[PDB]
């Protein structure tokens, strides 16, 4: 009984930044995310399950969404997306489309376009009920360099504040 206060809900494997190490290519150092294997005292490895929200954000940013219908067409196998979206019930798509920007001159317009796309795609974190106020701060024009820091606002696993305007996220058990 009284023990109750701890959800029996668990978390599955989570993709993590720099799980497979950096990859230098003389332009900089990338992250190459993947799955982190946590070892034990006596063999018995196990996949890690931390940073759930960042895991969803990586799953969203780093997967191509469906392309838009053009008169040119697409190769049967290049039109992006996931067939598993045919079975979900929330009536949404899976992935992002930052890599589908219609490039143009005057890189300020390209920056604004990428901002719009990244924000529209990351809003699915709030729509799923995992964060509350995800937001981006994409600001640069350089030659082509761009910085795109992302903030994923979260909660705790026990409602400690009374009288909020919104409504507790539906999945505040991941701790966001």
């Amino acid at each position: 009984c009284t023990v109750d206060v701890a959800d029996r809900r668990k978390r599955f494997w989570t993709t993590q930044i720099a799980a497979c190490g950096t990859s230098s290519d003389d332009c900089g150092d990338c992250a190459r995310p993947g799955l982190q294997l946590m070892c034990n005292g006596q063999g018995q490895v196990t996949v890690s399950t931390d940073n759930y929200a960042v895991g969803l954000a990586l799953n969203i940013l780093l997967t191509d969404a469906s392309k838009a219908d053009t008169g040119c067409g697409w190769t049967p196998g290049n039109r992006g997306g996931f067939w598993g979206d045919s079975f979900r019930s929330d009536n949404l798509r899976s992935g992002s489309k930052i890599r589908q920007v219609p490039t143009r001159t005057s890189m300020r317009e390209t920056v604004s376009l990428i901002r719009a796309y990244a924000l529209d795609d990351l809003k699915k974190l709030v729509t799923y009920g995992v964060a509350k106020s995800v937001d981006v701060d994409l600001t640069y024009r350089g030659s082509n360099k761009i910085d795109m820091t992302v903030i994923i606002q979260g909660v705790d696993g026990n409602e400690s504040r009374v009288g909020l305007t919104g409504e507790r996220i539906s999945n505040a058990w991941v701790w966001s």
Binding site: A18, C30, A31, V54, N78, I98, R99, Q100, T103
Partner: protein
Amino acid sequence: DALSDGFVRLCIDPSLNFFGEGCKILVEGQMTDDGSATPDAVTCVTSELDIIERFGQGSVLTESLRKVFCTCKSGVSVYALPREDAAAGVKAVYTLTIAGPATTDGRVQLYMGEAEYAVDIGVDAGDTATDIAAAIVAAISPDFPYAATAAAGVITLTARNAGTIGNHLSVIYTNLGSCTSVTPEGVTVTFAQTTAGSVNPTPNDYATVVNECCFAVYVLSSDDTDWQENLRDWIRSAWDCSKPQCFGHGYVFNKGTLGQVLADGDNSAELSRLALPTTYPVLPYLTNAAYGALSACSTCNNPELNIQGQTFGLLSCINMPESCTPGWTFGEVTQLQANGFVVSGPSTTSGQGNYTSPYIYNDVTNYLRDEKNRPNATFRDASSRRLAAATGVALAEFLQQFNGLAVFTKNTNIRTGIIGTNPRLMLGKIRKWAQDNVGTLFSEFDNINEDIQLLTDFEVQPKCVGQPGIFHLNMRYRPPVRGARINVNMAPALFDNC
């Protein structure tokens, strides 16, 4: 990747924690010998899973760090400064005597330190005091800052760190001498405090350890007033006019009776004393570190936020059972408010027992007099200090456009095409920047005509001593004011006449 399709190529930053790295908090305290950290050297702490192996199990610093992590999970990067125990330190030893034998079953509950170290065991009838003590010692939390042992029903708690930080546990909350619905009938306890505190580390080497490595909030987990005075001297040196500043603020505590607390304070405008009564349940450095971490990680980009009140100044990681007397009596509360002392009290009115959570009133610094002994209230509010720092950085960042700009004094007639300026125009631009930040950095003003002065070096130094290009910007401001002092004059009127 070569296999990719489009052209927009994202390059994820190797790791997260970007939005921090600007709110560094230095937690200072002692560590045990189990730890693998090099003493007397600042070293950051990323996560909570590796403080026990780095700073030893159950040490003083290993729990200050735990409270700093519990308080706010992200937003800051914490740096631990471990301090080795003193050479001639004698660990403080407490004795806890248990007398049986029990006659009816029940539970034995004890509250040592805070709620995280609480213990709760089951006791059958016919059990002897030796078995009760053995069970207690077998269920005592290993992170408790006291190595616990048992012998013939007598429990000995030996402080894991040698020094006077072992003398701050004197109020244990048992469940054995009452009528609670679970009570081994025939079991009593006794608190002893056999040995006593000792000599404390007095390093005084902050210059060498951290010199130009600017921090935001220093937390001290010790009560030796000389160590607090060394920390105050460091933070005061950091606010100097000689070297470029690394603004900061420090958090210490001072536990004892009213006179002792009023005696430990001074005009140290850089610290924030936390007055704690003699019978405080929580180990003092725990609540000190909770307040320090909350202050450090809520006021990163909001430097005007005052940390005081049941919402913005709540210490959620602290859970105390209430007491008969309210610790500081109201008279003593006001006495402490007056002499720049922070006071913490319980939020809910829950009655004896009945866990609660302390919060802070008057988030103020220990600054009550000025230079040349003239009383003030400029640096009383702890937000006034953060706003002084922010005003400095913002003004100095704004003034950068005049670097290398051609300046025309003695003729103030920049020709057609030159990209220069003159002191009147610089003063106009600065005055506009000032009256532009009214409401975010300054109060309204009192007289902006003579509050802001821009003089040229050629008219301050004596004749044929000034240098070309040097300037002098003298500003006088007031941080944004808050609240009012309305005076009601309620008076009825039976007669009427309209």
